[PDB]
Coordinates of C-alpha atoms in Angstrom, one line a residue:
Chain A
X58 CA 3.1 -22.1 31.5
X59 CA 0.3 -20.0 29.4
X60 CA 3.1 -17.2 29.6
X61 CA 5.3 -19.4 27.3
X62 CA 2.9 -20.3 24.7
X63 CA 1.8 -17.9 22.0
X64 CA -0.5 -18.5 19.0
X65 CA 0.5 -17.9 15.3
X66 CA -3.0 -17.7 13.9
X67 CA -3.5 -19.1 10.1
X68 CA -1.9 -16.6 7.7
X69 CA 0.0 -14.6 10.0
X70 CA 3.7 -15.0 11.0
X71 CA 5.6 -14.2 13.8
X72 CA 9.1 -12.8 14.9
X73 CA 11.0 -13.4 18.1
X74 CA 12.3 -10.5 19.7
X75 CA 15.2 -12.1 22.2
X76 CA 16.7 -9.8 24.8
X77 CA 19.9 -11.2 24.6
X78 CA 19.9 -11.8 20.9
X79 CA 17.7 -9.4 19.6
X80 CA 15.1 -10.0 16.4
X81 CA 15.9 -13.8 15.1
X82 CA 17.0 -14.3 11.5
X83 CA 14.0 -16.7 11.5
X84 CA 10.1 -16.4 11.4
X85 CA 7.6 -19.2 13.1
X86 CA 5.1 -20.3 10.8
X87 CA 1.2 -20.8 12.3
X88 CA 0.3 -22.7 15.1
X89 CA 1.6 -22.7 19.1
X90 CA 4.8 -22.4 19.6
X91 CA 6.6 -22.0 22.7
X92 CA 9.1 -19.0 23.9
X93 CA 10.9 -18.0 27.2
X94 CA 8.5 -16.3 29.6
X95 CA 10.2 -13.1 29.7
X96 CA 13.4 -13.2 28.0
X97 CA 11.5 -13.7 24.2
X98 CA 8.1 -12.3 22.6
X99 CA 6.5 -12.2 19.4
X100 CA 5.3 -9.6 16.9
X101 CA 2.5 -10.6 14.6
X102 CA 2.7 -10.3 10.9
X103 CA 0.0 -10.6 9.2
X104 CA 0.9 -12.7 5.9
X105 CA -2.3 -12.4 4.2
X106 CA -3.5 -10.7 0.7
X107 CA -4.6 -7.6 2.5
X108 CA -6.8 -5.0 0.2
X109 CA -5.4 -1.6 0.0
X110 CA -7.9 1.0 -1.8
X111 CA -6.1 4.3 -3.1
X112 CA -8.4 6.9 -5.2
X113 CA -6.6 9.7 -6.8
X114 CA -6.9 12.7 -8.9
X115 CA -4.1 12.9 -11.3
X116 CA -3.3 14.2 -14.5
X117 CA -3.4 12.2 -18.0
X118 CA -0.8 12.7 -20.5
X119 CA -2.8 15.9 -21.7
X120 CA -2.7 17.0 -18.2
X121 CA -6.9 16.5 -17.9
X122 CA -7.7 15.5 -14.6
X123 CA -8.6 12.1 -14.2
X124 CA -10.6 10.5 -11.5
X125 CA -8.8 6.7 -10.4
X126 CA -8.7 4.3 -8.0
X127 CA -5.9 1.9 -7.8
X128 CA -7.2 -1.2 -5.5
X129 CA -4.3 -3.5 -4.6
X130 CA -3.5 -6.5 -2.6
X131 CA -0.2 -6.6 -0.6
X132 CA 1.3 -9.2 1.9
X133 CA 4.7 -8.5 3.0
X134 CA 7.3 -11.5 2.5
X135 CA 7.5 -13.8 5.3
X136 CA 11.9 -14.1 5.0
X137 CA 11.8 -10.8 4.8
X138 CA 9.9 -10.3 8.2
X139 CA 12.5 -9.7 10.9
X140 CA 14.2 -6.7 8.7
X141 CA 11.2 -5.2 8.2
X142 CA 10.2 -5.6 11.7
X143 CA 13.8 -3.7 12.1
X144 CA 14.0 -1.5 8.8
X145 CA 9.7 -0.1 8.9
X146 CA 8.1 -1.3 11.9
X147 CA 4.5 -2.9 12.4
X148 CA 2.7 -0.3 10.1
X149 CA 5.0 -0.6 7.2
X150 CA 1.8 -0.3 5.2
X151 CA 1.3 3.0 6.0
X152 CA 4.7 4.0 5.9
X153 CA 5.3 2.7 2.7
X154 CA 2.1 2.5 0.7
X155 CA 1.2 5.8 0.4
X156 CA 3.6 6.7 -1.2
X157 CA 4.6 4.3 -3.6
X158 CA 1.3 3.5 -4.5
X159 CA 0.6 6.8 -5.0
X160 CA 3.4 7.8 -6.8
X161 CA 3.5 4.7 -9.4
X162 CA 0.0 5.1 -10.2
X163 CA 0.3 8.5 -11.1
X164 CA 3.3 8.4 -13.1
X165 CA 1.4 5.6 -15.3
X166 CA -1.7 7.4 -15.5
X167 CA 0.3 10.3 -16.9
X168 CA 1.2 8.0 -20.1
X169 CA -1.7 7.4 -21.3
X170 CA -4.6 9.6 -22.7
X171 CA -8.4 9.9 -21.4
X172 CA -9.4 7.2 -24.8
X173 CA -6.2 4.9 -24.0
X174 CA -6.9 4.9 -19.9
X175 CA -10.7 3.6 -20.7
X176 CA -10.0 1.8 -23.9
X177 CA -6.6 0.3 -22.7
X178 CA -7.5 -0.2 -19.1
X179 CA -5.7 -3.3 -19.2
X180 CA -2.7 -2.3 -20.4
X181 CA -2.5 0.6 -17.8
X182 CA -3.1 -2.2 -14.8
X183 CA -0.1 -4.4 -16.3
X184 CA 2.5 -0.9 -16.1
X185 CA 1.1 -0.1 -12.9
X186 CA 1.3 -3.9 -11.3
X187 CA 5.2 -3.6 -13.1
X188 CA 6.1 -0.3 -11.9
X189 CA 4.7 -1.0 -8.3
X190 CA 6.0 -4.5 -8.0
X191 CA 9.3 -3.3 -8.9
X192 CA 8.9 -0.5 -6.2
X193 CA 7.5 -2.3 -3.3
X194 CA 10.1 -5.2 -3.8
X195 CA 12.5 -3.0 -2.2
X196 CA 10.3 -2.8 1.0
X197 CA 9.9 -6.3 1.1
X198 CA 6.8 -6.7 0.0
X199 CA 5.1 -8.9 -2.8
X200 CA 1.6 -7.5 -4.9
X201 CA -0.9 -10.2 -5.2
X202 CA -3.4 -8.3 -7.6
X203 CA -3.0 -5.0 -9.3
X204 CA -6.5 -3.6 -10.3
X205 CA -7.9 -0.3 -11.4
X206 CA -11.1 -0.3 -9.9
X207 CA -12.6 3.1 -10.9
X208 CA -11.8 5.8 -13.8
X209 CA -13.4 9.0 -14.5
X210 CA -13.3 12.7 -15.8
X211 CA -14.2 15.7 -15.0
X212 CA -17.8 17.6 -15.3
X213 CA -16.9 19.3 -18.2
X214 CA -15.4 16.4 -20.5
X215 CA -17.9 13.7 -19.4
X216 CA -21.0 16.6 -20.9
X217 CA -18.7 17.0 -23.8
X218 CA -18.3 13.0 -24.3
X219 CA -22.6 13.3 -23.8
X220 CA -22.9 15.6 -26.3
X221 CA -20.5 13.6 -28.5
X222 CA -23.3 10.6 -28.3
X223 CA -26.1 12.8 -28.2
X224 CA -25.2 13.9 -32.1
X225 CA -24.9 10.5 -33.0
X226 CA -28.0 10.1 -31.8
X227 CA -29.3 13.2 -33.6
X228 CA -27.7 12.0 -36.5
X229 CA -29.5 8.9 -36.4
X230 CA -33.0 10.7 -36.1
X231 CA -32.1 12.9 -39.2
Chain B
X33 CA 15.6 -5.4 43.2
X34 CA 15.3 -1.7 42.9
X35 CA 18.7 -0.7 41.6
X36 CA 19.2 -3.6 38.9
X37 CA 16.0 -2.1 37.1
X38 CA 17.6 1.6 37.7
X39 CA 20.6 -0.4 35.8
X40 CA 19.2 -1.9 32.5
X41 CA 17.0 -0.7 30.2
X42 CA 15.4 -2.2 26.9
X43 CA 15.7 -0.9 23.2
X44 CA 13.1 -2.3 21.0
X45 CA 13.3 -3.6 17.7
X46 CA 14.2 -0.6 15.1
X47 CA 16.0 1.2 17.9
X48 CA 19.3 2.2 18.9
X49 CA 20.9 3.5 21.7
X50 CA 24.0 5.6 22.5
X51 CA 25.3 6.5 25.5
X52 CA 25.6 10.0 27.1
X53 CA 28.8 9.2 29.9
X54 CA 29.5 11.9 32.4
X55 CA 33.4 11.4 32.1
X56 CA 33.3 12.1 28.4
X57 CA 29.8 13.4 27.1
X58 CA 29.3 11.3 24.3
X59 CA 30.5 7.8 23.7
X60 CA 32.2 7.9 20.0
X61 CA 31.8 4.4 19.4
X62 CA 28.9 2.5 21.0
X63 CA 25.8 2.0 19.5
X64 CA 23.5 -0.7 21.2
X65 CA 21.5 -2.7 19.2
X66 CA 18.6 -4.9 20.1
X67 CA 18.8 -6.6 23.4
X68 CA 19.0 -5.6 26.8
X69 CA 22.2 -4.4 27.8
X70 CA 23.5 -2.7 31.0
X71 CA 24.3 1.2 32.0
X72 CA 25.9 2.4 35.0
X73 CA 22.9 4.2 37.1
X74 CA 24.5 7.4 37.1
X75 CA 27.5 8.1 35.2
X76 CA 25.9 6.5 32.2
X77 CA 22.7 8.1 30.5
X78 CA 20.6 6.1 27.3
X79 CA 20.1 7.9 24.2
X80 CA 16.9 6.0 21.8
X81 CA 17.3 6.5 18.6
X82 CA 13.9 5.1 16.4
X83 CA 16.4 4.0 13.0
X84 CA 13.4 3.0 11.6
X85 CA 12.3 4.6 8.3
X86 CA 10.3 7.2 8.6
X87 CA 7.6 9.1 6.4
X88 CA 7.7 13.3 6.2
X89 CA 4.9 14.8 3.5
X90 CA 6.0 18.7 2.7
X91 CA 3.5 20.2 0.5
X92 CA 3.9 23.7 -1.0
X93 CA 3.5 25.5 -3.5
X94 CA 6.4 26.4 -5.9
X95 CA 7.3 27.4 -9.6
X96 CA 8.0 25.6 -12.6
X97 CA 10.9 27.0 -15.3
X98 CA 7.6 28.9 -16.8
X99 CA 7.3 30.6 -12.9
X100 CA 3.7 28.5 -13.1
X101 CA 2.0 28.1 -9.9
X102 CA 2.6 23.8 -9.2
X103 CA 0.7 22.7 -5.6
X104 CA 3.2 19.9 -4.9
X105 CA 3.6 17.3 -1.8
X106 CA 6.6 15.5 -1.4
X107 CA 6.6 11.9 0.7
X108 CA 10.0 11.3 1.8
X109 CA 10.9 8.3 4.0
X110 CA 13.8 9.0 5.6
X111 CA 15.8 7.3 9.0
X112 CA 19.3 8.2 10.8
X113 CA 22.1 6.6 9.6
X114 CA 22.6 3.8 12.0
X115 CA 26.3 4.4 11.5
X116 CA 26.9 7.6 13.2
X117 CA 24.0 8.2 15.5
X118 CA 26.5 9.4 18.4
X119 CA 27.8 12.4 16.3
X120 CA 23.9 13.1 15.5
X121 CA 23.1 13.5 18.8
X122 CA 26.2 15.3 19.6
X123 CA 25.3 17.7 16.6
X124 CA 21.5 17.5 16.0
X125 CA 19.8 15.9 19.2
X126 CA 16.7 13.5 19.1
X127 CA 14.8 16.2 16.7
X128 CA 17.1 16.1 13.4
X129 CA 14.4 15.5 11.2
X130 CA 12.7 18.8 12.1
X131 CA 15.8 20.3 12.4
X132 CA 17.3 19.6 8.2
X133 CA 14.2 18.5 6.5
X134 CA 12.1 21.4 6.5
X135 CA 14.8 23.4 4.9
X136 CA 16.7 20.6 2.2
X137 CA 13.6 18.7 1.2
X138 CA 12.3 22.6 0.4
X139 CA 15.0 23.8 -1.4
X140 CA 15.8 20.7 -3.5
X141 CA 12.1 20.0 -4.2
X142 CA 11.3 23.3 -5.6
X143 CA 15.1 23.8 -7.3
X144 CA 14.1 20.8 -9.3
X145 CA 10.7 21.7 -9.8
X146 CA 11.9 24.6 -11.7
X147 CA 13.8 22.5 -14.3
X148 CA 10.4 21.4 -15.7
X149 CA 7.3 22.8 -17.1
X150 CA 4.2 21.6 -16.2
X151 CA 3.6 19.2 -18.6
X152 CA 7.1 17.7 -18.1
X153 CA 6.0 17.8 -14.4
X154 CA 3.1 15.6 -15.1
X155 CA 4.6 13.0 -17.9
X156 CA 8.2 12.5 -15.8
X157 CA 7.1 12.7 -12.4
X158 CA 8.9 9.6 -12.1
X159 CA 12.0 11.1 -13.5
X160 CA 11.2 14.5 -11.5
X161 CA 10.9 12.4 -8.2
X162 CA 14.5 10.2 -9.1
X163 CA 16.6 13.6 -9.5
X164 CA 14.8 14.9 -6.5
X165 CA 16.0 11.7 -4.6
X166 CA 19.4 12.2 -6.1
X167 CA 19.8 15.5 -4.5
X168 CA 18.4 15.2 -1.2
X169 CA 20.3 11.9 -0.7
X170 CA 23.6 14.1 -1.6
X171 CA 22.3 16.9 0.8
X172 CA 21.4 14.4 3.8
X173 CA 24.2 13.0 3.7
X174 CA 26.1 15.6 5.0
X175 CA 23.5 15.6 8.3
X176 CA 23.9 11.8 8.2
X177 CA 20.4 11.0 7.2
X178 CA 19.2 8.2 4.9
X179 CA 16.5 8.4 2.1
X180 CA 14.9 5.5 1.7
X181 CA 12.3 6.3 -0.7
X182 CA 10.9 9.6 -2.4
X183 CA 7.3 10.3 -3.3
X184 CA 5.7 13.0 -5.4
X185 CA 2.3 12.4 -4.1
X186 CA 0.6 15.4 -5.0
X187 CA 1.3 17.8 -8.2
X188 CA -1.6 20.1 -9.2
X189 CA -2.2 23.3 -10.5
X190 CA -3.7 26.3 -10.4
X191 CA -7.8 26.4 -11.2
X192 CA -7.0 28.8 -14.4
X193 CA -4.6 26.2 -15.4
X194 CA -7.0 23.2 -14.8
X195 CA -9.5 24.9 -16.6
X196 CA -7.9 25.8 -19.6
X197 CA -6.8 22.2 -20.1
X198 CA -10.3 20.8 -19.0
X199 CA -11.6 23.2 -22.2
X200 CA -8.8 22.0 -24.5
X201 CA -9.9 18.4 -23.9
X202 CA -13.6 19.6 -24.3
X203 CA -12.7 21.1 -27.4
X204 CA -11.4 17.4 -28.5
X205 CA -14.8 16.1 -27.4
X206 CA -16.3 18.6 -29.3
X207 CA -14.3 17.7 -32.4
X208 CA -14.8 14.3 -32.4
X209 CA -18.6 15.2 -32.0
X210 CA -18.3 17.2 -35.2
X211 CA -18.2 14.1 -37.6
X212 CA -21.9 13.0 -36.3
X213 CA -22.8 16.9 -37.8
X214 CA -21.6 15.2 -41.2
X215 CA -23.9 12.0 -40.9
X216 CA -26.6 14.5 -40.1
X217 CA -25.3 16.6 -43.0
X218 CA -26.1 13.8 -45.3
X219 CA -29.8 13.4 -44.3
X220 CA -30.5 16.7 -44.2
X221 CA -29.3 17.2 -48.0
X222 CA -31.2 14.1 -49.1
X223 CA -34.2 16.2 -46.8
X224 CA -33.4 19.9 -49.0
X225 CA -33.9 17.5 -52.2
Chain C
X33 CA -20.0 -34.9 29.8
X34 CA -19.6 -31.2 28.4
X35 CA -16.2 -32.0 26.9
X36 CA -17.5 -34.5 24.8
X37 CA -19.8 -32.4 23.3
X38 CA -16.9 -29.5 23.2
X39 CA -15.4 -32.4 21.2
X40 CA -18.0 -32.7 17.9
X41 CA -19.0 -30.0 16.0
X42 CA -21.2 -30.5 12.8
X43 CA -21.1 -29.2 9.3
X44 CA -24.5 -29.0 7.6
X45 CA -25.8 -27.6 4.6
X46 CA -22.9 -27.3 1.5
X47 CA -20.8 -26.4 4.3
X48 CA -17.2 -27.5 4.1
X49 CA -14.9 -27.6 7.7
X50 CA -11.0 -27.0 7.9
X51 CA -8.5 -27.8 10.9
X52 CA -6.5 -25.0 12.3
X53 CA -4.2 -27.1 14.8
X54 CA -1.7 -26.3 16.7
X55 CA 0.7 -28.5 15.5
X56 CA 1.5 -26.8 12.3
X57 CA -1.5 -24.4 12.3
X58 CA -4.0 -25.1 8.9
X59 CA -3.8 -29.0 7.8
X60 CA -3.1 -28.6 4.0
X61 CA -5.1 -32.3 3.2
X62 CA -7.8 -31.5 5.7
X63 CA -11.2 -30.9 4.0
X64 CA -15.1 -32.2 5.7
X65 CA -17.5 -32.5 3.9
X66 CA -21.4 -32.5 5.6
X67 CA -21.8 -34.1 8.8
X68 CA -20.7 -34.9 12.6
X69 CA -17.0 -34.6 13.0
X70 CA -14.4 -34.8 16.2
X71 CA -12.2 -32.5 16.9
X72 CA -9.5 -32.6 19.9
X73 CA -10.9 -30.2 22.4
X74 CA -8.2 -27.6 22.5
X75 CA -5.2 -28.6 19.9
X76 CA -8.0 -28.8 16.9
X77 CA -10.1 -26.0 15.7
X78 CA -12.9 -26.1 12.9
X79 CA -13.0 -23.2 10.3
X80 CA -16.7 -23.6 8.7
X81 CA -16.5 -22.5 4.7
X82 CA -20.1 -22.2 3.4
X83 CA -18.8 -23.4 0.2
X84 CA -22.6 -22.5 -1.9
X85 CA -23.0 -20.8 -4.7
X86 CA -23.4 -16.9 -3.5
X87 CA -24.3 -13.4 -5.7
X88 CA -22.9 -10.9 -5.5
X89 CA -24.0 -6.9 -7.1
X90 CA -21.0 -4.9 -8.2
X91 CA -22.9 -2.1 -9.7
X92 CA -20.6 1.5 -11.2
X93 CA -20.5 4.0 -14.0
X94 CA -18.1 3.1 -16.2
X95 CA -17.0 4.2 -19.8
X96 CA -17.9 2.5 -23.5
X97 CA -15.7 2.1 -26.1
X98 CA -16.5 5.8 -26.4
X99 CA -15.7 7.3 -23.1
X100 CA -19.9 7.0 -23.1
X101 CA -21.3 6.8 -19.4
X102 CA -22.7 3.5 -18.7
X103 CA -24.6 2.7 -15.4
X104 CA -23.7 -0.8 -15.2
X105 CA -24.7 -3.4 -12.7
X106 CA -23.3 -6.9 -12.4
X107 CA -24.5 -10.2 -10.6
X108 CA -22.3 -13.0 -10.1
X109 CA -22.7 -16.2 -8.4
X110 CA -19.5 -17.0 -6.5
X111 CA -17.9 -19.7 -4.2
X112 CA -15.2 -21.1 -2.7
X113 CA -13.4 -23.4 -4.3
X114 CA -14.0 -26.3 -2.2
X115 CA -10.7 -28.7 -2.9
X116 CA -8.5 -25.4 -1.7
X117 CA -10.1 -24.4 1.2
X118 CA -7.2 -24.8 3.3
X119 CA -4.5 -22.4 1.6
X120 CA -7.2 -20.3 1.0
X121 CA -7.4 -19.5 4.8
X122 CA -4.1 -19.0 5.0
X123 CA -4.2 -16.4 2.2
X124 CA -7.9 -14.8 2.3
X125 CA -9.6 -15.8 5.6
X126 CA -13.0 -16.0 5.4
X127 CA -13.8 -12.7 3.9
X128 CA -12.1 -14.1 1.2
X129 CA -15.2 -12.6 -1.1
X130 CA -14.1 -9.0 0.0
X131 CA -10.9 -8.8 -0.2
X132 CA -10.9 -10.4 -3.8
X133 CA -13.8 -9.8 -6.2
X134 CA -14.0 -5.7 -5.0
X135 CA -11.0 -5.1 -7.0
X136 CA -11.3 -8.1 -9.9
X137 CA -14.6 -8.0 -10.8
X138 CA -14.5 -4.0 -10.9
X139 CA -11.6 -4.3 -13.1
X140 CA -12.6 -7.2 -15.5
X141 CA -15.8 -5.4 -15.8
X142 CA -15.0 -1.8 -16.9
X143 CA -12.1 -3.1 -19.1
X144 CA -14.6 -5.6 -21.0
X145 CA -17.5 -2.8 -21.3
X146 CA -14.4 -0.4 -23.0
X147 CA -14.2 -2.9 -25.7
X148 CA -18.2 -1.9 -26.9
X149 CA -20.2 1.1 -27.1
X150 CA -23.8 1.7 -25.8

């Protein structure tokens, strides 16, 4: 009867797929649950906060090009499973993700300048977390953490913000 | 044992199928959803349709209102309306995403493009990417697609462009370095003295 | 006698154990502390949580209050907390560590060294 068991591990979900019913309303939480041999099977779901990393080069709100990674963790909602399952498929991470996650991040970024994005970083997490939230709802999916892991500039600006400090220091010695 | 399997086929979760019947082509008004369901060996012919939504990246190059060079890449998550997949195959086949997206998503990307100037391009993107969405939803429509989302993933410029603002930034820096000169300015009076 | 000991595991050293069973998957009030414990051969399964204190070095460039480079490298001592181990398999697994502080600590970091400059 092995054929008519299957394993929902911890933090994963699963949806029946009936042949004579198709995809079930209704997701089986963790543990071993039993199916008809051939005329059910399950598709894993994996309902965990899973880490997506996304660096970009964007434009500020003076168009300067600005070096960030948005790191976010994503599980999709468990009710929400079977139309997923139906609406995205198995991957609906990488069908959806990049994209949105690009997109949102980008459009923030553009709001702030080079000072506010470092000075403010903050700020610029909490419209980003909003913004994608508010996006990825729509997919079914919830946002566990929002963060901007890494921010810099280019070449030229960082030797220019160098210099800046180096004529304090200058100014110091005088 | 044989024939019953040449009789039934399976269409997976996300799928559809339509059936192609030798009396009459086409069937107008079945669409199979998940399950099993049964076709006659011969006369009847199983059409899969993936319904799912699907991501398409176009990236090109186009002009802003100010004929500016703007390096733009377009995700668009599209799928076939569920509704009327038996016309689709009667009009576009199992490639209708190749066959309307490589010319609507074009044209509407890069008509709307040239609304903005480059700095509108950058500070609306969201706004940009919503009036996009608004006109290639009205365009699929007509080809009975479905936009599900719409991505501007990518919008860059060209390296004189980049340049020019990295050296008006710079020149910020440079300002803002300026009022150490005056601190320095002080001592070196107090030095003259 | 091979089930039997199939049957005991032990949990040793600031270790902590959760039940994954298959009667409901993770037992939410389930939590062993150091020792020998018993687990039904195949409906029970142990998930050992070394629940010590453990460093961690997040070291990046970030920028000061003014935009300033700063090569700045952080140690922190982190664990599990022990009276949640349960959901906390459910929701992290045991790479818990990197799916969490990569992103937080990152974040918390750079947005408390913008607040200062060198």
């Amino acid at each position: 009867v092995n054929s008519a068991l299957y394993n929902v591990d911890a933090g994963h979900r699963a949806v029946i797929f009936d042949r004579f019913r198709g995809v079930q309303d209704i997701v089986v939480g963790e543990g071993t649950h039993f199916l008809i041999p051939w005329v059910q099977k399950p598709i894993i779901f994996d309902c965990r906060s899973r880490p997506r990393n996304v660096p970009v080069i964007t434009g500020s709100k003076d168009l300067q090009n600005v070096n960030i990674t948005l790191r976010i963790l994503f599980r999709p909602v468990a009710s929400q499973l079977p139309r997923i399952f139906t609406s995205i498929g198995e991957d609906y991470d990488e069908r959806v993700l990049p994209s949105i996650t690009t997109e949102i991040l980008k459009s923030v970024v553009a709001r702030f300048d080079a000072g506010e994005l470092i000075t403010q970083r903050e700020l610029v997490s909490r419209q980003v977390s909003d913004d994608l939230t508010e996006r990825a709802a729509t997919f079914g999916l919830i946002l566990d953490d929002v963060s901007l892991t890494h921010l810099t500039f280019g070449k030229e600006f960082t030797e220019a913000v160098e210099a800046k400090q180096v004529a304090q220091q200058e100014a110091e010695r005088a | 044992a044989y024939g019953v399997r040449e009789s039934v086929f399976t269409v997976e979760g996300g799928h559809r199928a339509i059936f192609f019947n030798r009396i009459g082509g086409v069937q107008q008004d079945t669409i199979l959803a998940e399950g099993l369901h049964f076709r006659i060996p011969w006369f009847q012919y199983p059409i899969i349709y993936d319904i799912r939504a699907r991501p398409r990246k176009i990236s090109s190059p186009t002009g802003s209102k100010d004929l500016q060079m703007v390096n733009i890449s377009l995700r668009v998550l599209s799928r076939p309306n569920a509704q009327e997949l038996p016309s689709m195959y009667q009009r576009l086949g199992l490639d209708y995403e190749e066959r309307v997206l490589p010319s609507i998503v074009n044209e509407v990307l890069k008509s709307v493009v040239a609304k903005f100037n480059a700095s509108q391009l950058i500070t609306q993107r969201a706004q940009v990417s919503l009036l996009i969405r608004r006109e290639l939803t009205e365009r699929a429509k007509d080809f009975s697609l479905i936009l599900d989302d719409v991505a501007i993933t990518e919008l860059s410029f060209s390296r004189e462009y980049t340049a020019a603002v990295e050296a008006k930034q710079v020149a910020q820096q440079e300002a803002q370095r300026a009022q150490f000169l005056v601190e320095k300015a002080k001592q070196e009076q107090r030095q003259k003295i």
